């Protein structure tokens, strides 16, 4: 019945995309012909979720895909998986983006987002109950930035009620691969924190410390990176698809993870993930899986979730596991962890258990949490946009493609607006706030 | 799809082109006379290289290329050549009189006798591009149709095309090497014309390559045949991302829209590394960090000026073969981390990074090294600002005295050319001081006490 779209744009976000497709194949059964030739009933029962079903037993995945430059387009197609890709779902520009935000809002974007959005339509009349829309994409990118929200901020206008959530590549703490990246962040942060309804932090520094140190990779390639994207959207998704004791689907999620309608960026987290070493010794439990889950040096942002406290917490357990060990060790957590929960929303956690675990693990569990410990990112990023503007550096490549400094004033307005937000609650009282005035004793006359 | 059409404008632009169009056929396979000698899908496929070429026949290519110096005498080189029988015989173009190291020649009389002829083939060539990019000029600033014609030029594309890429690729001033007593004339009236209509600029100094060939690559002589072969494998990393597949690719606008904080502040000196000998290559390590240190040292810099006489504003770093993401951002949190190695006090994001599979692939006919992976870096730095005040001292002594003027005159030129040319100079000399500065604020006049 209830059913998911999921676009892919930009360079970055159409190679995370690829492989998300692949790893989702995988846990369907699907050979790389489309077809279903998998391994069990639930599988196919289910396959409805993520794909349209075709004559001469085919299914065809309800993804589509976007970039104004055709390169890496191309490489998607004659890749693995390419081929079960629907050809009219691939839409392309000839120019690229040119990594501004503004190129991908206002010029080559504008002039393609049309043809897309009458496939995104053709797609949502191929379902019966149209869940909403998953996106990936980079903040860090021209089009997954600028052509990504530019469709973000229109199918909401066109999709009132229906979920559109995100898994956005976000600038990380170190390094940067983009020079523009505080300019398109700034300006991508303006348009989702209105028109979406989750938006998933993933940061490379991270990715990178999570395949060096904890699965021991000597030379963590983007091949590596990918899956573990993949396998936590996959975990985000399971209570669609995969049945168990506690489903929870992609709206009683959300619910569960935005206290207030701007609060909705997630440090997301996947366990357990063990070095071919490591496997052999530690067992796979649930209480490995809780703290593992909590292990701040493990969750896929590169800012530390132990720098603030969090508003809520979610967990998306995939296996045979049994309801006091979980609900205990959850438990456990927030009695030796106090400091770390935001004490005005009580008993910060969202439960919830599949049957069914990741193909090739005998049993694992998401993370989403929501902490004030993201305050890190947008605190670093609108200084690094105040350093541009202030300066109008790098600016006449955006406003000579019609953009005015209103827009950039606006962007910038927001987000520091939206840092003080969450300042506001990094670490707010459960105790009455202001207004501490009173009425006094009675006067001789 | 995503086409690039380049024009190599007098003697130095040609001389480039000839060791450019070698590696260009050479890395796809494509032989000296056009052909593919071996295609698995006549008619179509992989083949992911029109972007650099035409197909013709039975999958034979045509070049997206321009030749143009006033002198049958190298353009004929290329008609009579090893590669003759690749090119279009209509984009080996001439002149009835080569430019006499001057100007004015150019941009006044004989390349403005030829320019027609030469924009109407490249408008047949643009309208075969069914996904134009934008076209890149090589040349020298020191050159005589080099200053002459590729002003005349990017004086009619920049509003025949607009919006499309307004790439050069330039021979830029040696410190003290010189070629012709008429450089910095050559130059500053290119500046002047030309610097309002490139996006980017990518800058490389002969006293520099010389300064490669005889430390790193350990040659004893280094022909321009040596130097310009060395150059071939600049545009070969800068092109890789249109020309192959990887993992984070950059197309000719990005480094625009990253290199270039100011529009006249868009001239990033090149580097290119590793540059080893081949006895070298047996006994480095080669890894990653290594290369990169070796791509910030100052003697290894394209540019002979020292970075560390300036400052960073920008860069872009991009990587080709076998590379890492990760390692990568393992050395690019090195040279970051090291604030000895000197950024502006504005600078919150300064970086631009690249992955593309393909390896590097060198030449037949050298002892020379075919590593696995390589960098290719370019710096946008006040260090530009140390032979930019070279220029300011190489002007001014001539034309006080007005030494040579009257060769520009006597040729189609204005005096208040020149002068408003140095103008200009004295413009882009603080353009440069304007940025060199450390982001703190304040205003006007006071000696008093507010506490
Ligand atoms: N790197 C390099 N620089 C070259 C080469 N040939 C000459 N030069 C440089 O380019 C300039 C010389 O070119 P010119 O002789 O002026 O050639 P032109 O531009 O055609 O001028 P005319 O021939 O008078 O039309 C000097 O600044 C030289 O240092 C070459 O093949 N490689
Ligand atoms: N994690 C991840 N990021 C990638 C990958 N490839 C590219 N990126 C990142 O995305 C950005 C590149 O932007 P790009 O996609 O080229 O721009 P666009 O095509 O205009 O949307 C940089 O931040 C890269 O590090 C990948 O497969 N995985
Ligand atoms: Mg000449």
Redesign the pocket.
């Known amino acids: 019945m209830r059913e998911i779209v999921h676009i892919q744009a930009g360079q970055c976000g159409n190679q995370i995309g690829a492989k998300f497709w692949e790893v989702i194949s995988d846990e369907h059964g699907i050979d790389p012909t489309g077809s279903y030739h998998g391994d069990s009933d639930l599988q196919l029962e289910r396959i409805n979720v993520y794909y349209n079903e075709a004559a001469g037993n085919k299914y065809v995945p309800r993804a589509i895909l976007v970039d104004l430059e055709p390169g890496t387009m191309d490489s998607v197609r004659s890749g693995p998986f390419g081929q079960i890709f629907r050809p009219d779902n691939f839409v392309f520009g000839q120019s690229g983006a040119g990594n501004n935000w503004a190129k991908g809002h206002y010029t080559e974007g504008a002039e393609l987002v049309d043809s897309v959005l009458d496939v995104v339509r053709k797609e949502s009349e191929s379902c019966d109950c149209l869940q909403g829309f998953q996106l990936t994409h980079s903040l860090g990118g021209g089009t997954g930035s600028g052509m990504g929200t530019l469709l973000i901020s229109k199918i909401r206008e066109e999709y009132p009620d229906r979920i559109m959530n995100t898994f956005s590549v976000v600038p990380s703490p170190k390094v940067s691969d983009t020079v523009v990246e505080p300019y398109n962040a700034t300006l991508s942060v303006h348009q989702l924190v209105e028109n979406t309804d989750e938006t998933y932090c993933i940061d490379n520094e991270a990715l990178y410390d999570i395949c060096f140190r904890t699965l021991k990779l000597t030379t963590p390639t983007y091949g590596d990176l990918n899956h573990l994207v993949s396998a936590t959207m996959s975990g985000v998704t399971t209570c669609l698809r995969f049945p168990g004791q506690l489903n929870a689907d992609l709206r009683k999620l959300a619910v569960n993870m935005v206290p207030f309608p701007r609060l909705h960026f997630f440090m997301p987290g996947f366990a357990p993930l063990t070095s071919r070493g490591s496997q052999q010794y530690r067992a796979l439990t649930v209480p490995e899986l809780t703290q593992q889950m909590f292990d701040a040096k493990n969750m896929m942002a590169a800012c530390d979730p132990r720098h603030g406290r969090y508003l809520t917490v979610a967990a998306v357990f995939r296996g045979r596991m049994s309801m006091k060990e979980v609900d205990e060790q959850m438990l456990n957590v927030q009695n030796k962890n106090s400091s770390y929960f935001v004490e005005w929303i009580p008993n910060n956690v969202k439960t919830a258990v599949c049957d069914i675990p990741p193909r090739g693990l005998k049993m694992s569990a998401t993370f989403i949490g929501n902490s004030t410990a993201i305050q890190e990112l947008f605190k670093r990023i609108s200084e690094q946009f105040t350093a541009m503007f202030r300066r109008k550096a790098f600016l006449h490549w955006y406003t000579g493609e019609g953009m005015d400094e209103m827009e950039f004033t606006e962007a910038e307005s927001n987000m520091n607006d939206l840092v003080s937000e969450y300042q506001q609650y990094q670490d707010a009282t459960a105790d009455e706030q202001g207004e501490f005035e009173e009425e006094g004793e009675e006067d001789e006359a | 799809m995503r086409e690039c059409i380049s024009i190599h ?8 082109g000839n ?1 450019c169009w070698e590696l260009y056929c050479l890395e796809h396979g494509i032989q000296p006379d056009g052909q593919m000698p071996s295609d698995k899908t006549i008619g179509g496929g992989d083949d992911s290289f029109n972007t650099f070429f035409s197909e013709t026949g039975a999958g034979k290519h045509v070049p997206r290329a321009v030749f143009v ?3 049958p005498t ?1 353009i004929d080189e290329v008609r009579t050549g090893t590669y003759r029988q690749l090119f279009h015989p209509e984009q080996l173009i001439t002149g009835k009189e ?5 100007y004015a ?2 941009h006044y009389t004989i390349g403005k006798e030829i320019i027609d002829l030469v924009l109407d083939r490249i408008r047949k060539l643009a309208d075969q591009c069914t996904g134009l990019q934008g076209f890149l000029v090589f ?11 590729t002003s005349l030029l990017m004086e009619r594309l920049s509003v025949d095309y607009g919006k499309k890429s307004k790439l050069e690729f330039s ?1 830029y ?2 410190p003290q ?4 007593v008429v ?1 910095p004339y ?1 130059s500053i009236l290119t500046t002047h014309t030309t610097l309002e209509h490139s996006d980017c600029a990518f800058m ?1 100094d ?1 006293e520099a ?1 010389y300064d490669i060939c005889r430390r790193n690559l350990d040659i004893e002589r280094p022909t ?1 045949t040596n ?2 072969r060395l ?1 071939s494998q600049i545009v070969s990393s800068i092109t890789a991302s249109l020309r192959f597949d990887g993992a984070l690719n950059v197309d000719l606008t990005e480094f625009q829209t990253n290199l270039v904080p100011y529009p006249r502040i868009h001239f990033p000196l090149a580097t290119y590394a590793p540059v080893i000998s081949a006895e070298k290559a047996y006994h480095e390590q080669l890894s990653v960090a290594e290369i990169t240190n070796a791509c910030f040292e100052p003697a290894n810099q394209m540019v002979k000026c020292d970075p560390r006489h300036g400052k960073y504003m920008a860069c872009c770093l991009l990587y080709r073969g076998d590379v890492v993401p990760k390692d990568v951002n393992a050395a690019i949190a090195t040279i970051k981390t090291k604030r000895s190695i000197q950024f502006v006090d504005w600078c919150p994001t300064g970086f631009k990074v690249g992955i593309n599979y393909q390896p590097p692939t060198v030449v037949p006919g050298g002892d020379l090294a075919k590593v696995q992976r390589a960098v290719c870096m370019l710096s946008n730095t006040t260090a530009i600002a140390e032979a930019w005040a070279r220029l300011d001292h190489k002007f001014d002594l001539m034309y006080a005295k007005r030494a040579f003027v009257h060769w520009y005159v006597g040729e189609g030129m204005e005096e208040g050319e020149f002068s408003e040319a140095r103008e200009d100079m004295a413009a882009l000399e603080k353009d440069y001081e304007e940025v060199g500065v450390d982001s703190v604020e304040g205003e006007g006049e006071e000696e008093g006490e507010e506490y």
């Open positions: 404008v007098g003697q130095a632009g040609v001389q480039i060791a110096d006033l002198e190298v080569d430019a006499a190291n001057n020649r150019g040349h020298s600033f020191g050159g005589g149709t080099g200053s002459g014609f021979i001033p040696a090497v010189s070629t012709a450089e050559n490389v002969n390559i321009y130097l310009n150059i």
